[PDB]
């Protein structure tokens, strides 16, 4: 069984910094495998057509 995705730390459009953590979360529900959203809004889902590819946001500490 593949292991959920991460959602990276990030910065919002407002300046607040939002730590990362795995999906699911532990009160999310078990489908919910993909760290979705924008680079300022991520949350864990289950739906691939809300899949954030996250390798190009810029708000993050990321490569």
């Not at 300046?15 to 979360?25: A, T």
């Not at 809004?41 to 810029?58: M, N, W």
């Amino acid at each position: 069984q593949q292991p959920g995705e991460y959602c990276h730390g990030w910065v919002d459009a407002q300046g607040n910094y939002h730590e990362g953590f795995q999906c699911p979360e532990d009160f999310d529900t078990q489908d919910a495998t993909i760290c979705c959203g924008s680079c300022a809004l991520r949350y864990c889902c289950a739906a691939a057509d809300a899949r954030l590819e996250q390798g190009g946001c810029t708000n993050d500490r990321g490569e």
